[PDB]
């Protein structure tokens, strides 16, 4: 009976792709791609040091080899994240052990961008993880191969939290909860941790959340549940759903297939859909999360003949309500970025308001100093109906 059962993906025509990109060749498990309503950012092969490419969404077709890039890093770029409160601002983590924050010029680059707004220098090792705070302006989390998590005030350039003796082994990912009061981590010691970064304490963990000696991912759902991907002892890709108030036993665990890539979860809290795709997969599998067991329900698979090297995900503000678009993927091939549009088939030409509840907007709910000092706020919601045409 699920309203999302006919959700389907459709790749755009080649003339709506971004072509002749030289995607990074590093063996780091990066997503290589970050998208916002103005720009697509792609981690590329740099002559020296490190670079990423920033394209206006309209700049489709073959990209000139000399198109300007963001190239101020002195080591390969490993992760990129657009500022949720500023569509001209992006953070990068590098093998040069820095996080850099960049101001993109209006309409994108004319000249190569070599000087960041700020360099953050707390890590002693490569920085593979950057995550902007969901609600607090200028709060930015990095995690490095030093196994330190640092939470920055980007406005002052100061490390205000250093979690440096919490993780004995490599950190695979860090995710903020809805109001950014908590983070969750997955680590190569096979633990998933829920952390209060301001209290600097672990509030819940699960040992061996997955048994495989392969990477995991852990993210928060809108209701405070933690959703994980990983591998069985037998190389099966798995997903699980955990109540952090009681992590002994999973609410749900599902075995999927025996491919090699870790499943990156993309969670849409507005539809309760989770999309899963791994490096090397030609498929995007999507599930609905509901309060009816077994709680994680299979919807469908987007199928293709081409494996992904990385994947970006368009925030709600960039979607087309008239088309009932509920997600847009930016699928990285070897030399190309290919938008994939997820739509709900609907007969009616009316505004499908059930698909588009008010969504987390770009206005920061509180300042860095307020949040660091212990204040909390929810995302400030906006309506998407201004985009509707009769």
Residues with Cβ < 8 Å from 67, sequence gap 6 or more? 53, 55, 109
Residues comprising the chain, all counted:
390
| CA separation for the pair 150, 160 (Å, rounded) | 8
| CA separation for the pair 226, 195 (Å, rounded) | 12
| CA separation for the pair 289, 295 (Å, rounded) | 5
| CA separation for the pair 344, 165 (Å, rounded) | 46
| CA separation for the pair 4, 293 (Å, rounded) | 17
Using CB atoms within 10 A of its CB, is residue 383 exposed (0-12), middle (13-18) or buried (19+)?
Answer: middle
Let me know: does 39 contact 54? Beta carbons within 8 Å. yes
Let me know: does 379 contact 222? Beta carbons within 8 Å. no
Q: Is the dihedral of CA 34, 127, 76, 78 positive or negative?
A: negative
Let me know: does 237 contact 229? Beta carbons within 8 Å. yes
Residues with Cβ < 8 Å from 375, sequence gap 6 or more? 366
Both tokens of 357, joined, read: 């509840």
| CA separation for the pair 187, 309 (Å, rounded) | 22
| CA separation for the pair 340, 217 (Å, rounded) | 23
Q: How was this structure determined?
A: X-ray
| CA separation for the pair 114, 367 (Å, rounded) | 28
Both tokens of 134, joined, read: 């969901």
| CA separation for the pair 4, 296 (Å, rounded) | 13
Both tokens of 50, joined, read: 């490190």
3-state DSSP of the chain: CCCCCCCEEEECCHHHCEECCCECCCCCCCCCEEECCCEEEEEECCCCCEEEEEEECCCCEECCCCCCCEEEECCCEEEEEEECCEEEEEEEEECCCCEEEEECCCCCCCCCECCCCEEECCCCCCEEEEEECCCEECEEEEEECCCCEEEEECCCCEEEEEECCCCCCCEEEEEECCCCCCEEEEECCCCEEEEECCCCEEEEEECCCCCCCCCCEEEECCCCCEEEEEECCCCCEEEEEECCCCCCCCCEEEEEECCCCCEEEEEECCCCEEEEEECCCCCEEEEEECCCCCCEEEEEEECCCCCCCEEEECCHHHCCHHHCEEEEEEEECCCEEEEEEEECCCCCCCCCHHHCCCEECCCCCEEHHHHHCCCCCCCCEECCHHHCCC
Let me know: does 108 contact 94? Beta carbons within 8 Å. no
| CA separation for the pair 28, 383 (Å, rounded) | 38
Let me know: does 151 contact 164? Beta carbons within 8 Å. no
Using CB atoms within 10 A of its CB, is residue 294 exposed (0-12), middle (13-18) or buried (19+)?
Answer: exposed
Q: What angle do CA 246, 249, 253 make, to 5 degrees?
A: 125
Q: Is the dihedral of CA 282, 275, 350, 1 positive or negative?
A: positive
Please state whether 166 falls in left (phi above 0), alpha (psi between -120 and 50) or beta.
alpha
Both tokens of 239, joined, read: 């997903």
Using CB atoms within 10 A of its CB, is residue 335 exposed (0-12), middle (13-18) or buried (19+)?
Answer: middle
For residues 314, 385, 350, 300, the Cα torsion angle rounded to the nearest 10 degrees is 20
Annotated domain spans of the chain: 8-387
Both tokens of 318, joined, read: 């960039």
Q: Is the dihedral of CA 35, 39, 41, 45 positive or negative?
A: positive
Q: What angle do CA 311, 317, 323 make, to 5 degrees?
A: 85
Both tokens of 71, joined, read: 């190239």
Residues with Cβ < 8 Å from 165, sequence gap 6 or more? none
| CA separation for the pair 40, 31 (Å, rounded) | 13
Q: Tell me phi and psi for residue 301, to 5 degrees.
A: -130, 125
| CA separation for the pair 277, 152 (Å, rounded) | 30
| CA separation for the pair 382, 316 (Å, rounded) | 10
Let me know: does 335 contact 63? Beta carbons within 8 Å. no
Tokens 């961008």 locate to 113
CATH architecture of 8-387: 7 Propeller (2.130)
Instruction: Give the other-Cβ count within 10 Å of 341's Cβ.
Output: 20
The residues facing 205 across adjacent strands are 193
Resolution (A): 2.0
| CA separation for the pair 269, 256 (Å, rounded) | 22
Rounded alpha-carbon distances, angstroms, from residue 136 to 83, 85, 366, 373 = 11, 9, 5, 12
């Amino acid at each position: 009976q699920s309203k999302f059962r006919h959700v389907f993906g459709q790749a755009v025509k080649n003339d709506q792709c971004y072509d002749d990109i030289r995607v990074s060749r590093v063996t780091w498990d990066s997503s290589f791609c970050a998208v916002n309503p103005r720009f697509v950012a792609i981690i590329i092969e740099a002559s020296g040091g490190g670079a990423f490419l920033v394209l206006p969404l309209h700049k489709t077709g073959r990209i000139d080899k000399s198109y300007p890039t963001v190239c101020g890093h002195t080591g390969p770029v490993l992760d990129i994240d657009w500022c949720p409160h500023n569509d001209q601002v992006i953070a990068s983590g590098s093998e040069d052990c820095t996080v850099m924050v960049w101001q993109i010029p209006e309409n994108g680059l004319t000249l190569s961008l070599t000087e960041p707004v700020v360099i953050l220098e707390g890590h002693s090792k490569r920085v593979g993880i950057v995550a902007w705070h969901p609600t607090a302006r200028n709060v930015l989390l990095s995690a490095g191969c030093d196994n330190a998590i640092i939470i920055w005030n980007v406005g002052t350039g100061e490390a205000l939290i250093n979690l440096d003796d919490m993780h004995s082994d490599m950190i695979y990912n860090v995710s903020w909860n809805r109001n950014g009061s908590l983070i969750c981590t997955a680590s190569k010691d096979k633990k998933v941790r829920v952390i209060d970064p301001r209290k600097q304490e672990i509030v819940a963990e699960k040992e061996k959340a997955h048994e495989g000696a392969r990477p995991m991912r852990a993210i928060f759902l809108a209701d405070g549940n933690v959703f994980t991907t990983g591998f069985s002892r037998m190389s099966e890709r798995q997903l699980a759903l955990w109540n952090p108030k009681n992590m002994q036993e999973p609410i749900a665990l599902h075995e999927m297939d025996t491919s090699n890539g870790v499943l990156l979860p993309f969670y849409d809290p507005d539809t309760s859909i989770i999309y899963l795709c791994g490096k090397g997969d030609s498929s995007i599998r999507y599930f609905e999360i509901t309060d009816e067991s077994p709680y994680v329900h299979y919807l469908n698979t987007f199928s293709s003949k081409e494996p992904q090297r990385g994947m970006g995900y368009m925030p709600k503000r960039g979607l087309d309500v008239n088309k009932c678009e509920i997600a847009r993927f930016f699928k990285l091939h070897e030399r190309k970025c290919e938008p994939i549009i997820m739509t709900v088939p609907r007969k009616s030409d009316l505004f499908q308001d059930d698909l588009y509840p008010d969504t987390a907007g770009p206005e920061a709910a509180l300042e860095a100093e307020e949040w660091f000092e212990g204040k909390n706020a929810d995302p400030i919601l906006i309506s998407l109906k201004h985009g509707y045409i009769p």
